[PDB]
Design a protein around this nucleic acid. Sequence first.
RNA 1: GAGACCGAUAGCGCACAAGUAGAGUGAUCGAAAGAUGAAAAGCACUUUGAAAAGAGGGUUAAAUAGCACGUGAAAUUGUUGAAAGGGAAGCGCUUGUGACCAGACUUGCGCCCGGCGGAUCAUCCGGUGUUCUCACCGGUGCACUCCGCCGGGCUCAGGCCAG
RNA 2: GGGACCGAGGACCGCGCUCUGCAAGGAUGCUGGCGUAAUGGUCACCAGCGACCCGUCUUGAAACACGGACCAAGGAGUCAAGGUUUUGCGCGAGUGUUUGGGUGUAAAACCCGCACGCGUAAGGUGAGAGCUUCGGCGCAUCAUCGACC
RNA 3: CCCACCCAUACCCCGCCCUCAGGGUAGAAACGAUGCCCUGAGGAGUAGGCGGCCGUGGAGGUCAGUGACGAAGCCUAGGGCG
Lengths: 127, 149, 139, 129, 52, 169
Amino acid sequence: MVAAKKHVPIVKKRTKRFMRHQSDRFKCLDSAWRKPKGIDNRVRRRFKGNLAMPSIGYGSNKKTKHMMPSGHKAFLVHNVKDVELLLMHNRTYAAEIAHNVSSRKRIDIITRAKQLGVKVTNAKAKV
Amino acid sequence: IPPKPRKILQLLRLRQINNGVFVKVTKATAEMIKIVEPWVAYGYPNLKSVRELIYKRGYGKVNGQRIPLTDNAIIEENLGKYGIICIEDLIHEIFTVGPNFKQAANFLWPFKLSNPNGGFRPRKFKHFIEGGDLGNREEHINALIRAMN
Amino acid sequence: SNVSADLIWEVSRNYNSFLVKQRTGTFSRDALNLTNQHSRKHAGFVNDKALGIVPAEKGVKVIAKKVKAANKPASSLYTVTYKSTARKAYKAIASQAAKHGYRADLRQAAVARASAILRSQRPVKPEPPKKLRGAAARR
Amino acid sequence: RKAPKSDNVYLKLLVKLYRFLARRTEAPFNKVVLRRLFMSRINRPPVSLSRIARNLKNGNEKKTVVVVATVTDDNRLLQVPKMEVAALRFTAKARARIEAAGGRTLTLDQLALEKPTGANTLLLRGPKN
Amino acid sequence: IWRKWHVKINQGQKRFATASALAASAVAPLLMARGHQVSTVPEVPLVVDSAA
Amino acid sequence: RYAATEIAPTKSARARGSYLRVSFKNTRETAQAINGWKLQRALTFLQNVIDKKEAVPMRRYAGSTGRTAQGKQWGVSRARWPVKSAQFLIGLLKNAEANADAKGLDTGNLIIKHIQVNQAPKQRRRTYRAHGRINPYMSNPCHIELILTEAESHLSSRQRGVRIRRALT
RNA sequence: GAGACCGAUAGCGCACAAGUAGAGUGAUCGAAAGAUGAAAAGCACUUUGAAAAGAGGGUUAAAUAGCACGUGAAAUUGUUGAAAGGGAAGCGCUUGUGACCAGACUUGCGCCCGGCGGAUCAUCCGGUGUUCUCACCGGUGCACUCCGCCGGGCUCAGGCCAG
RNA sequence: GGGACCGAGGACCGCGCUCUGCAAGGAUGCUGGCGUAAUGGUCACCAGCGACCCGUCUUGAAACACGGACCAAGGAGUCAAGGUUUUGCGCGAGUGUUUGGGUGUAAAACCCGCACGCGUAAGGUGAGAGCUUCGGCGCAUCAUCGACC
RNA sequence: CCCACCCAUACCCCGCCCUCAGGGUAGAAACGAUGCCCUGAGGAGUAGGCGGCCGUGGAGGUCAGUGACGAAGCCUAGGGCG
């Protein structure tokens, strides 16, 4: 059915991104995280008041990982065969139509998914 | 810390801070503890201290693992061949130093105590005989243990 | 001999034409896969005894592998279409999987697949009207 | 070692079989066989018909010689005796000479069938040096 | 141009691989796994009459 | 295309000039001077600037500009007379007024709703400088555009009860 | 004739009126530079302007393609919208205000009644298939049994924040 | 007696007890409001607290010194030969087809003659993994005494 | 000299991530066995060593993949996963 399977509460240890050092000061440095290799760098040495560093300690719960706030795991679907592939996982997986799928094929995918009970993440894109 | 105290702490199984253990009083052990004087506080525990330490913070070394002592079956499967089949037997062996005290103490994982409720004395790094917390407090180690638990 | 279900799983666990792999899970497009999940339990084309349930025009078409016909694909699948009652399809499908020892571990999955296909064949409810909120609603 | 270095599916099947046997039996024979299956080629030197023949020259006749290695033929032997040999792989000449002598070629899965605990088995290794 | 574009393979290994491929072609599930639509065909190692 | 796309084209008048050979900075300053004004006021002001009767304030590009009492009309000290930019804006404003006449709008009620000066592709000259260097003289042209337009519950049960009681009493 | 090559800062220096423009007395040195559109159908006519051009109008699927032409990033800039600012800004943790948003829910399941309306109640008979005991058809069934709808009643489970 | 933080697990199994049950191997029951921007989130700003500008180089370390106007694109352990260690694969006292020749759906694939490259043409004492008919057999290899060239 | 009080990433309890270690799992109602279940411990890190993943151009196979009812690129005070 529409409602997802019962699950433990979704806890996110950290909600904001890991910003690369000096990306605020330079426009040539994109915000994507990079490991600082400087031997004197304060962000590498972990001085207080500085940017945090990604670590496995921030890892999300194994039984909660990869699922949306609704509780489904996203599955990228390109066609009616993909939604029929999701047929058996109504309460665990949700369908997400790929960006390159045309309007009529999206309509068909939503129709088959609504027959199957499979939740659609982007059901109202081209309506 | 010098290497001789570093080795004595390793052998007394005091790897962390607030890391109490039981020791059988003897010439060799007393000399070890007297050398490691500047880092530990030791004394003579009583029945209540032993009972509460075993009951609340008692864990066993089972195949090299820390198992909470929730079961007389665990006690029997580990120390049964020495006649210790229950936590009462373990407490008795610890308190009245029996023939198998070495086996009982080693089975007991070193007790990981919390910081005292009430703190230590104003300057904890002198001797108990000089207004501090280090060294041999004969029967006041009981009060320290109530603070630690 | 040289070939078995174990050998086939050894060859095909890492890559199939039926294998679809994404970040949230690995699935299988095989018609003899009752849960569309990549596993030796559910690899129908791998296992000697296997079951598969597909939709019909009104009901469910159930296929099962014939162990004495693995060399003959055109005559390797016992196909029965169950177009009577939901409860009767479940009875027959659970017997085909558990009475004579052909995949009792897949009995539950087969019954669930039949139920899901029948619910899919059931007529579908109209949508609730969409309600706008905040700036969009006042816009 | 948990996974073998080899990519051979049949060696993987043998590894699974003997892992099950080692876990579900009290057999150090099975444990050592699993260990020797996990070791690599340079640590599994070939065993020759000469070495096996002189290891059965004593009262060890009428037995199953198990070697987790490849058995090689030795031209220095004019005669090969009857013998119950099991190994990972044989040479063509080793098979031919054993079968002409009157023995039987055996694989490790077969040896697991007839002798799942290693009874009347002479376990042999080849020259490392 | 001297990049060593070609690979020397033992002929025994080439023949081993060919034999394994023939056995795999004889195996029926492997055709479906490779992506061949073999469901209306009997006798996976098809033999069609030479006179035909 | 025009930057201000929120104005319907049937109710306004427009004018454009591109690759105009006039100082971008001075043209921007005088455009800001005439921004938001009525058409006649802007035309008279630009003519007065040409005649050095009134001066435009230099706000941003105002390095080392002399002080004049005319700047007091703007609450500033740096005022200057960009004659060339004034003439260019007069030309575009008259073109926009002619477009308004063609469209039939009332010319006495038009304001300068949008005016924008952007930088055009730079042009080159070269002069001869000492110590072996040739000094570049890129001229700085600008684009100008302008548009004139006509001047014209989910309350709680407790809250619901409180309101009902207060309405009754 | 080809390629597991390169794809306009690449590939020969040269995909173009390139060994050209240009530099050096000379031997010599030596670049930059591709793309509208299917088709020029490359904007008739009106109006403002000295003109360049602008505004209407028109061609085109598109002028958000006008020969400064495929798509059109950043640096930098203008206009508008919102905001901050007692001798730096920027960055981390945590609220608060304002603006703007993704989810979740719209009820599902199962029992007690009545109205129905239909077609595949149990058992048995023949054929077929199969895991040789399980099914499938066709007949039988004749509607206190099945299967769907409606008008009601009840149970359980259902979102957010809390006591 | 009062307060705070937490509720991990998910049929039964076990230790127990105060045993018609239980506070005994991890939270249930009852109720209310709302069911929508209300919770939640992203941006901008304020507020309290924290917080040296990066890289290179030198030294025990600092300091100095050097590079840094900004952005886009390009940009630096590759290839070959000869050695050598390890891992995977085939054959194995042998191994290597592709110099060349024969087919070919034609630079592919398949097959092969004679050479050639590299390699090859006996114990005792004590341990010892692993077997045993529990009397003992005894891999590899090691220490010593050996035997031969 | 005495009493109470304040707080570190230290110590004690609980949750979660990962790593390591020790066990269980087939006359299979049976498994991405490269899986799953149980228990315990541990977590700074330069040179260096090992492993797994992410991304780009091109090639073989496959998804009987997507696409003028709009591929790719690009923008985004709009979201989701890691």
